[PDB]
Design an enzyme around this catalytic site. Structure first.
Site, PDB file in Angstrom:
ATOM      1  N   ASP A   4      55.600  69.860 132.264  1.00  0.00           N
ATOM      2  CA  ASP A   4      55.442  68.961 131.126  1.00  0.00           C
ATOM      3  C   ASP A   4      53.982  68.587 130.906  1.00  0.00           C
ATOM      4  OD1 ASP A   4      56.136  67.472 128.952  1.00  0.00           O
ATOM      5  OD2 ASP A   4      56.914  65.784 130.104  1.00  0.00           O
ATOM      6  N   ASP A  34      57.690  49.954 135.311  1.00  0.00           N
ATOM      7  CA  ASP A  34      57.749  51.392 135.046  1.00  0.00           C
ATOM      8  C   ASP A  34      56.971  51.686 133.776  1.00  0.00           C
ATOM      9  OD1 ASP A  34      58.665  54.103 135.289  1.00  0.00           O
ATOM     10  OD2 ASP A  34      60.777  53.614 134.787  1.00  0.00           O
ATOM     11  N   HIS A  69      56.415  67.717 126.168  1.00  0.00           N
ATOM     12  CA  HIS A  69      57.623  67.241 125.466  1.00  0.00           C
ATOM     13  C   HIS A  69      57.292  66.398 124.271  1.00  0.00           C
ATOM     14  CE1 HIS A  69      57.556  63.373 127.735  1.00  0.00           C
ATOM     15  NE2 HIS A  69      58.165  62.914 126.642  1.00  0.00           N
TER      16      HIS A  69
HETATM   17  C1  LIG Z   1      61.232  65.061 129.154  1.00  0.00           C
HETATM   18  C2  LIG Z   1      62.060  63.800 128.978  1.00  0.00           C
HETATM   19  C3  LIG Z   1      61.437  62.671 128.450  1.00  0.00           C
HETATM   20  C4  LIG Z   1      62.118  61.470 128.269  1.00  0.00           C
HETATM   21  C5  LIG Z   1      63.447  61.402 128.665  1.00  0.00           C
HETATM   22  C6  LIG Z   1      64.086  62.511 129.198  1.00  0.00           C
HETATM   23  C7  LIG Z   1      63.415  63.724 129.343  1.00  0.00           C
HETATM   24  C8  LIG Z   1      64.187  64.969 129.791  1.00  0.00           C
HETATM   25  C9  LIG Z   1      65.154  64.693 130.954  1.00  0.00           C
HETATM   26  C10 LIG Z   1      64.973  65.619 128.606  1.00  0.00           C
HETATM   27  O1  LIG Z   1      64.025  66.016 127.586  1.00  0.00           O
HETATM   28  C11 LIG Z   1      63.850  65.160 126.554  1.00  0.00           C
HETATM   29  O2  LIG Z   1      64.528  64.174 126.357  1.00  0.00           O
HETATM   30  N1  LIG Z   1      62.865  65.606 125.743  1.00  0.00           N
HETATM   31  C12 LIG Z   1      62.177  64.840 124.772  1.00  0.00           C
HETATM   32  C13 LIG Z   1      61.417  65.478 123.804  1.00  0.00           C
HETATM   33  C14 LIG Z   1      60.759  64.734 122.841  1.00  0.00           C
HETATM   34  C15 LIG Z   1      60.764  63.344 122.867  1.00  0.00           C
HETATM   35  C16 LIG Z   1      59.891  62.554 121.879  1.00  0.00           C
HETATM   36  C17 LIG Z   1      60.638  61.774 120.826  1.00  0.00           C
HETATM   37  N2  LIG Z   1      61.883  61.974 120.454  1.00  0.00           N
HETATM   38  N3  LIG Z   1      62.120  61.102 119.438  1.00  0.00           N
HETATM   39  N4  LIG Z   1      61.078  60.375 119.209  1.00  0.00           N
HETATM   40  N5  LIG Z   1      60.135  60.790 120.080  1.00  0.00           N
HETATM   41  C18 LIG Z   1      58.567  61.984 122.367  1.00  0.00           C
HETATM   42  C19 LIG Z   1      58.556  63.130 121.426  1.00  0.00           C
HETATM   43  C20 LIG Z   1      61.512  62.691 123.855  1.00  0.00           C
HETATM   44  C21 LIG Z   1      62.201  63.447 124.804  1.00  0.00           C
HETATM   45  C22 LIG Z   1      61.631  61.184 123.883  1.00  0.00           C
HETATM   46  N6  LIG Z   1      61.998  60.645 125.196  1.00  0.00           N
HETATM   47  C23 LIG Z   1      63.378  60.186 125.362  1.00  0.00           C
HETATM   48  C24 LIG Z   1      61.058  60.637 126.163  1.00  0.00           C
HETATM   49  O3  LIG Z   1      59.903  60.968 125.918  1.00  0.00           O
HETATM   50  C25 LIG Z   1      61.434  60.290 127.594  1.00  0.00           C
HETATM   51  N7  LIG Z   1      60.212  59.890 128.266  1.00  0.00           N
HETATM   52  C26 LIG Z   1      60.174  59.119 129.424  1.00  0.00           C
HETATM   53  C27 LIG Z   1      58.961  59.044 130.096  1.00  0.00           C
HETATM   54  C28 LIG Z   1      58.824  58.311 131.232  1.00  0.00           C
HETATM   55  C29 LIG Z   1      59.906  57.569 131.754  1.00  0.00           C
HETATM   56  C30 LIG Z   1      59.817  56.684 132.896  1.00  0.00           C
HETATM   57  N8  LIG Z   1      58.710  56.633 133.659  1.00  0.00           N
HETATM   58  N9  LIG Z   1      60.885  55.906 133.281  1.00  0.00           N
HETATM   59  C31 LIG Z   1      62.048  56.046 132.629  1.00  0.00           C
HETATM   60  C32 LIG Z   1      62.240  56.886 131.571  1.00  0.00           C
HETATM   61  C33 LIG Z   1      61.157  57.639 131.074  1.00  0.00           C
HETATM   62  C34 LIG Z   1      61.269  58.432 129.906  1.00  0.00           C
END
Ligand SMILES: Cc1cc2ccc1[C@@H](C)COC(=O)Nc1ccc(C3(c4nnn[nH]4)CC3)c(c1)CN(C)C(=O)[C@@H]2Nc1ccc2c(N)nccc2c1
Ligand SMILES: [Ca+2]
Lengths: 251, 56
Positions: free
Chosen positions: A90, A183, A41
């Site tokens: 992922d 976290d 991601h």
């Molecule tokens: C896969 C995913 C990741 C995240 C949130 C939701 C999702 C899914 C459902 C939807 O999928 C997404 O939301 N996809 C997605 C794609 C690109 C970006 C990136 C970004 N976007 N803008 N700047 N950076 C990192 C590239 C981003 C999310 C940013 N972002 C919220 C994230 O990384 C976030 N990470 C964590 C990682 C670990 C976490 C933890 N332990 N406790 C709490 C929250 C957490 C969030």
């Protein structure tokens, strides 16, 4: 990272910082001199594939102390089963354009064998998660690398202890606390979940997803690296292909 | 199937063989000791070891 501490310089020597156009993007884990494991991601929004840089031996983002080594990312390999904007599968395997030089400050984390990881490492309760992510939910990211010790849960127990969220699949695991104290955060995405066993550290998870950061009733969700060992090993034996992004069949 | 129980006594990897046979193995950058269970580094920077803590 919320509720952890500064990783003393050189004690997280496999930690990678990924930059795009010089800006912090994600973390990663060095597994040998040329390969880095991160989260798929992390690459969903990249337009400038040629401006992706991995930095090893990083500690404090405000100063250059000479232990940092920067390398261009030549290839980003993602499983065919990963869908942009979702949670399953992922993982990303990154090939550096030139190897890093191993030093006291740049060392790979062991990528374990699948059997060893599923039979033994999966039952080691606590593991370390690290990165330069948010120190607080909706707060500033860290200038020094942070580390946190988190306990792993069986998926049945994660579902029971959690209060429209996506499913926790066999390619994931929960780790952390549901009391909102500790976290890993979005800025830590792609970073290592490292497990110690009989004097050596191994890669067992990748910081993947969750809700906010350290939110009450929710654990952190990590990619279950053991499901990808054979996939990663086969790719590391492969020749580079033109173009940065490569989608590779999974399994 | 000795490997499922306490890693077959191996420090790192464990392989089950036909009968009551077991072979421990190590990651690259390590060799197996004559005890048949322990892994010792063969390189300066073996994986999963922290130099500033090892040198302490
Ligand atoms: C896969 C995913 C990741 C995240 C949130 C939701 C999702 C899914 C459902 C939807 O999928 C997404 O939301 N996809 C997605 C794609 C690109 C970006 C990136 C970004 N976007 N803008 N700047 N950076 C990192 C590239 C981003 C999310 C940013 N972002 C919220 C994230 O990384 C976030 N990470 C964590 C990682 C670990 C976490 C933890 N332990 N406790 C709490 C929250 C957490 C969030
Ligand atoms: Ca620095």
């Amino acid at each position: 990272i919320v509720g952890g501490k500064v990783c003393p310089k050189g004690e997280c020597p496999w930690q990678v910082l990924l930059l795009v156009n010089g800006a912090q993007l994600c973390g990663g884990t060095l597994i040998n001199t040329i390969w880095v494991v991160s989260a798929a991601h992390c690459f969903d929004k990249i337009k400038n594939w040629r401006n992706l840089i991995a930095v090893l031996g990083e500690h404090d983002l405000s100063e250059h102390d000479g232990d940092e080594q920067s390398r261009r990312v030549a290839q980003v390999i993602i499983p065919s089963t990963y869908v942009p904007g979702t949670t399953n599968h992922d993982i990303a395997l990154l090939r550096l354009h030139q190897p890093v030089v191993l030093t006291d400050h740049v060392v790979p984390l062991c990528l374990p064998e699948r059997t060893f990881s599923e039979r033994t490492l999966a039952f080691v309760r606590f593991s370390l998660v690290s990165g330069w992510g948010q120190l607080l939910d909706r707060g500033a990211t860290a200038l020094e690398l942070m580390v946190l010790n988190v306990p792993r849960l069986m998926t049945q127990d994660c579902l029971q202890q959690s209060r429209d969220s996506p499913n926790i699949t066999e390619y994931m695991f929960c780790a952390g606390y549901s009391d909102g104290s500790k976290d890993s955060c979005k800025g830590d995405s792609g970073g290592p979940h490292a497990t110690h066993y009989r004097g050596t550290w191994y890669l067992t998870g990748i910081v993947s997803w969750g809700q906010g950061c350290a939110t009450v009733g929710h654990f952190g969700v990590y990619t279950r690296v053991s499901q990808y060992i054979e996939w990663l090993q086969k790719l590391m034996r492969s020749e580079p292909r033109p173009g940065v992004l490569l989608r590779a069949p999974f399994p | 199937l000795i490997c499922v129980n306490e890693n077959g006594g191996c420090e790192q990897y464990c392989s089950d063989h036909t009968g009551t046979k077991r072979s421990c193995r190590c990651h690259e950058g390590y060799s197996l000791l004559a005890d048949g269970v322990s892994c010792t580094p063969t390189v300066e920077y073996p994986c999963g070891k922290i130099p500033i803590l090892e040198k302490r």
